[PDB]
Amino acid sequence: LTCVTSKSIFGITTENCPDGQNLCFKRWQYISPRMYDFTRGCAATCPKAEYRDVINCCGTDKCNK
C-alpha cells in the first residue's frame, strides 16, 4: 500500500507503507475551538478518534489524497 503523506500545489508526497500497515489515514486533530491540525499517511489500524478529533481510513493506493 502507498499512501499520501503531504499534499499542496506542488503535488503530493507518497510513502510505500511499511509491512503490516495496510491503511491510509486522514486525521483532524482538535487544537482549540478555532483550530484543527491535519495529518495524513499510513497506518496499521484505524483507531477510534477521541472527542473533537476525526479520523478517516481507507485501504487502496493513494485513497487519502
UniProtKB/Swiss-Prot annotation:
Miscellaneous field: Negative results: does not show interaction with adrenergic receptors (ADRA1A, ADRA1B, ADRA1D, ADRA2A, ADRA2B, ADRA2C, ADRB1, ADRB2), dopaminergic receptors (DRD1, DRD2, DRD3, DRD4, DRD5), histaminic receptors (HRH1, HRH3, HRH4) and serotoninergic receptors (HTR1A, HTR2A, HTR2B, HTR2C, HTR5A, HTR6, HTR7). Does not show interaction with muscarinic receptors (CHRM2, CHRM3, CHRM4, CHRM5).
Keywords tagged on the record: Disulfide bond, G-protein coupled acetylcholine receptor impairing toxin, G-protein coupled receptor impairing toxin, Neurotoxin, Postsynaptic neurotoxin, Secreted, Signal, Toxin
One of the record's GO cellular component terms: extracellular region
Role noted for this protein: Binds specifically and irreversibly to an allosteric site of the muscarinic acetylcholine M1 receptor (CHRM1) at subnanomolar concentrations and shows a very slow dissociation rate. It also inhibits agonist-mediated guanosine 5'-O-(3'-thiotriphosphate) (GTP-g-S) binding and downstream signaling, and decreases the dissociation rate of orthosteric antagonists (N-methylscopolamine (NMS) or pirenzepine). Is a potent negative allosteric modulator (NAM) for CHRM1 activation and a positive allosteric modulator (PAM) for antagonist binding.
Protein name as it appears in the record: Muscarinic toxin 7
Family: Belongs to the three-finger toxin family. Short-chain subfamily. Aminergic toxin sub-subfamily.
Region (Finger loop 2): 23-42
Stretches the record annotates as Finger loop 3: 45-57
Disulfide links within the chain: 17-42, 46-57, 58-63
Domain commentary: The finger loop 2 blocks access to the orthosteric site of the muscarinic acetylcholine M1 receptor. Comparison of MT7 alone and MT7 in complex with CHRM1 shows that finger loops 1 and 3 undergo large structural rearrangements upon binding to CHRM1, facilitating extensive interactions with the receptor, while finger loop 2 is mostly unchanged.
Subcellular location: Secreted
Tissue localization of expression: Expressed by the venom gland.
Molecular-function annotations in GO: receptor antagonist activity; toxin activity
Organism: Dendroaspis angusticeps
Keyword match Cytoplasm: no
